[PDB]
């Protein structure tokens, strides 16, 4: 019954976007049951989210956006990126570069620069990288790496570099960029029977260069740069076992250097993946609607079933929430223990549902190609469709939380909804250590909830304290010592809670684990009044004295 409440802003002006009347959860820009539309106008205008866009100079926002919409429908987009929450650029295979700026969830500015179109000779750009100083371009049928350097920050110079890779006529060359702009990679899903399918590229001194190359042992599902030791190139390679069954191989390269690999068995072949912002969690979408999470610290593979094929996945930048998206518009929310979370669009009545259907959003054939939490709060999720509308999904993530949605906030909501079993699985996924502070507070919320109110709940109390007392993978000792005083106090209250009910044997075992002076006497006086346990408790008391 726990859910997140959201509102969608659809930036397209198309009349094919058949949002239902009184569907207050979705807003659309308008060009220059009607009473329900007017009522939504009143809400939108009482709010700071205008029903229509300015057509007035200098911005001419209505017209500049309309040209962007034409560009989206008539051309493939090779890149979309954000510089900050209000700044976006997107690039097309047409060679047109577009930048837009936002206020709140709403559009304020559109700029279209078509001057690059007649200057860049190309065949089918498949990919691009964007920085303020330069753009990197890649093509489906060429060994050309096209490099653009801006004299601004348009006024620019065009350079070309030769790509060393094989089969230039058909191979799709993917690109990625470090936050340190001095390093870039190019890669392709080579299948064959000179050898490299990944290049290490540098940038320095106004020039692009090739530094080195590797051949991976399996053809990658993804290639990404790390945020730590950022030059390091992480991959996820799907592979076939000698068992003739699918696996994911998380190879890492420092090139020819493969510094590490981890093999995770799969129920079915992976179709997508992403990394959690802490990088301690790898999530793969897979065939037959399966979702697999590997926790490196706990060294455990968790499985879950999903109601949609997870072709697109993206982590919330707080790291606490995963989104799973179908290309067909189904959306599902998961926590970091892979429990499903209900989704609701704003409405006058309360209706949490396990998935959200964006099939309601339009009658368009256009498919979802991107979900992205907007890069630097973070309550805005950018959506893009190919040959379809752009827009942003806003998450109304609490007032007292000040819009935050950490693992701690999910725990509090699960306490509020009494979803305790799920809250404990999350607590287990915290891995303590670096996250121990947030984990500790989440434990306290769970234990206080249960101590204030049955053997089923005792099992939950045992497990929650168990996440510290019996780790699936051991805690660092300094983590133990940081929380040792408070965890023991929460356990002491549980011992007393158990004694009030006729369950002395388990309470006895906890008294042994705690080992406090005279603690055993609390078993003795009750067992004294199963009467045999009273003498055992006397013996245990003597083991401290």
């Amino acid at each position: 019954m726990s859910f997140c409440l959201t509102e969608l802003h659809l930036w397209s002006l198309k009349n094919t976007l058949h949002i239902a009347d009184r569907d207050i959860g979705i807003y659309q820009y308008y060009d220059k049951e009607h009473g329900n539309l007017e009522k939504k106008q009143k809400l939108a205008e009482s709010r700071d989210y205008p029903w229509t866009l300015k057509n007035r100079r200098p911005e001419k926002l209505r017209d500049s956006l309309k040209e962007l919409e034409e560009l989206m429908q008539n051309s493939r987009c090779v890149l979309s990126k954000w510089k900050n929450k209000y700044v976006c650029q997107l690039l097309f295979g047409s060679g047109v570069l577009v930048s837009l700026s936002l206020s709140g969830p709403q559009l304020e500015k559109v700029v279209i620069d078509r001057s690059l179109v007649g200057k860049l000779i190309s065949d089918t750009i498949s990919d691009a990288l964007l920085t303020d100083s330069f753009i990197i371009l890649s093509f489906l049928a060429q060994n050309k790496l096209c490099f653009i350097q801006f004299t601004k920050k348009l006024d620019y110079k065009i350079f070309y570099y030769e790509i060393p890779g094989p089969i230039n006529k058909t191979t799709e060359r993917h690109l990625a960029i470090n936050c340190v702009h001095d390093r870039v990679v190019c890669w392709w899903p080579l299948v064959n029977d000179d050898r490299a399918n990944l290049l290490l590229l540098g940038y320095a001194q106004g020039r692009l260069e090739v530094l080195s190359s590797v051949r991976t042992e399996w053809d990658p599902l993804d290639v990404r740069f790390g945020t730590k030791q950022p030059y390091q190139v992480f991959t996820v390679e799907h592979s076939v076992s000698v068992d003739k069954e699918p696996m994911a191989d998380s190879c890492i390269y420092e090139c020819i250097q493969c510094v590490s690999v981890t093999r995770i068995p799969l129920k079915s072949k992976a179709i997508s993946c992403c990394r959690n912002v802490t990088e301690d969690k790898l999530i793969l979408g897979c065939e037959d609607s399966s979702l697999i999470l590997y926790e490196t610290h706990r060294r455990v593979t968790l499985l879950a079933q999903t109601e949609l094929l997870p072709s697109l996945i993206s982590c919330h930048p707080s790291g606490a929430i995963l989104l799973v998206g179908s290309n067909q518009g189904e959306l599902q929310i998961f926590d970091m223990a892979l429990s499903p979370i209900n989704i609701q669009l704003l409405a006058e009545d309360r209706l949490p549902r396990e998935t959200l259907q964006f099939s309601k959003l339009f009658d368009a054939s256009s498919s979802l190609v991107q979900m992205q939490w907007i890069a630097p709060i973070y309550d805005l999720l950018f959506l893009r469709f190919e040959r379809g509308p752009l827009g942003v999904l806003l998450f109304k993530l609490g007032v007292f939380t000040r819009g935050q949605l950490g693992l701690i906030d999910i725990i509090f909501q699960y306490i509020h909804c009494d979803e305790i079993y799920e809250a404990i699985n999350i607590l287990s996924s915290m891995n303590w250590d670096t996250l121990g502070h947030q984990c500790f507070i989440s434990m306290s919320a769970i234990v206080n909830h249960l101590l204030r109110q049955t053997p089923e709940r005792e099992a939950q109390l045992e497990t929650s304290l168990g996440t510290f007392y019996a780790p699936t993978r051991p805690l660092l000792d300094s983590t133990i010592l940081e929380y040792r005083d408070q965890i023991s106090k929460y356990a002491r209250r549980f011992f007393h809670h158990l004694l009030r009910y006729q369950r002395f044997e388990k309470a006895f075992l906890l008294a042994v684990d705690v080992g406090a002076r005279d603690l055993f006497m609390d078993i003795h006086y009750l067992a004294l009044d199963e009467l045999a346990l009273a003498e055992v408790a006397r013996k245990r008391a003597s083991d401290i004295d």
């Binding site: 207050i24 009473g35 329900n36 009522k39 009143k42 409405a347 006058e348 009545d349 309360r350 209706l351």
Partner: protein, 393 residues
């Protein structure tokens, strides 16, 4: 639930009647005699100790006592949820006023002959049961005259008032199913229980082409045998002429009536099919409206409608109940630039009705709305609806 009403002569302690209803239906069940004597004996005990008992209520029921003059105690027991003393007090004012209209304050006050009252009040039982059960009338609860808006109000009103001198009275009205469609200025100056009770009596009585039912009008004529004459022209449609003892029965002759009412046949027929609704056919209501209760607070007249939607959720019987119950709530907030609303039902949409009310310009409108209605849009909806109804009252 069930309802019981008991009446006793305070001067002797002897019960005058007991009436009851079950499910809103007339019922023959009466309370135990020792209970009845104790219900009044406790009231008279308070009387001798300078205390007026006015109510009691059990978890299942509400019980109300009233003392009228020195002679009448009315005790009402209602086993229904959401019943309150205001509804019951207004009911007992209507019942007592009905006792006044049937016998006057003579006999009814300073009671000596109990046996005469036992026989004389029997006619009252039919009207009392009609009040105890459900009907598509709100005047008994609002103390406003139940009303209808005709498509041709100026045509009916001029012909209705032009007849008043010919009728021998300044008090004339046109009634559909207990609702007033049109009435004269003299008719509109009738006092609160008086203006409501008169059409209630008319609607509760079996139809006649020429009724003559005596009415000892409480306002200025409580001891004088004024009489109410009514003329049925179409089913549930009748004229009322409110008369002193002086006006002849010849005033009811068709030879005088036809020239005042025949020209009005079209709008008279137009008001007939309204039944439970009060607005003229084709009125531009918002489609989410399930019904209205429109009060005019200065004019003391109100329209009552339940819209005949085929969704039947709530049923018309429930819609009548909902508007009556909402009014009772409205009078604990609005009654001595404001609005009120309720949303009924379970967590899912489609589970219950929206209700709204607004007071503007000394008229107050109550609204029963479809489950699909937006809850944020209610005020502007209420504002537009009032503006459409503004010209009518």
């Amino acid at each position: 639930g069930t309802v019981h009403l008991l009446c006793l002569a305070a001067s002797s302690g002897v019960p005058l009647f007991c009436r009851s209803s079950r499910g809103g239906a007339p019922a023959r069940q009466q309370l135990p005699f020792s209970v009845i004597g104790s219900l009044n004996g406790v009231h008279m005990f308070g009387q001798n100790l300078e205390v007026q008992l006015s109510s009691a209520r059990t978890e299942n029921t509400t019980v109300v006592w009233k003392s009228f003059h020195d002679s009448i105690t009315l005790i009402v027991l209602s086993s229904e949820v959401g019943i309150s003393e205001l509804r019951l007090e207004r009911l007992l004012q209507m019942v007592f006023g009905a006792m006044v209209l049937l016998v006057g304050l003579e006999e009814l006050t300073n009671i000596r002959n109990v046996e005469r009252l036992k026989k004389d009040l029997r006619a009252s039982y039919c009207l009392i049961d009609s009040f105890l059960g459900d009907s598509e009338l709100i005047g008994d609860l609002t103390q406003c005259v139940d009303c209808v808006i005709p498509p041709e109000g100026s045509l009916l009103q001029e012909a209705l008032s032009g007849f008043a001198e010919a009728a021998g009275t300044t008090f004339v009205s046109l009634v559909v199913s207990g609702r007033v469609v049109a009435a004269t200025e003299g008719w509109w100056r009738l006092g609160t229980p008086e203006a409501v009770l008169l059409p209630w009596l008319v609607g509760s009585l079996p139809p006649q082409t020429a009724r003559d039912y005596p009415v000892y009008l409480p306002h200025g004529s409580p001891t004088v045998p004024h009489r109410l004459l009514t003329l049925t022209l179409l089913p549930s449609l009748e004229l009322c002429l409110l008369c002193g003892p002086s006006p002849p029965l010849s005033q009811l002759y068709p030879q005088l009536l036809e020239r005042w009412w025949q020209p009005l046949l079209d709008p008279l027929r137009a008001c007939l099919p309204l039944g439970p609704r009060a607005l003229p056919s084709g009125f531009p209501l918002h489609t989410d409206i399930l019904g209205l209760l429109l009060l005019h607070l200065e004019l003391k007249r109100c329209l009552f409608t339940v819209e005949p939607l085929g969704d039947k959720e709530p049923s018309p019987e429930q819609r009548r109940r909902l508007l009556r119950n909402f009014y009772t709530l409205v009078t604990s907030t609005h009654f001595p630039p404001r609005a009120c609303y309720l949303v009924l039902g379970t967590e899912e949409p489609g589970t219950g009705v929206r209700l709204v009310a607004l007071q503007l310009g000394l008229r107050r409108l109550l609204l029963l709305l479809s489950p699909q209605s937006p809850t944020h849009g209610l005020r502007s909806l209420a504002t537009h609806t009032l503006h459409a109804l503004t010209p009518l009252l």
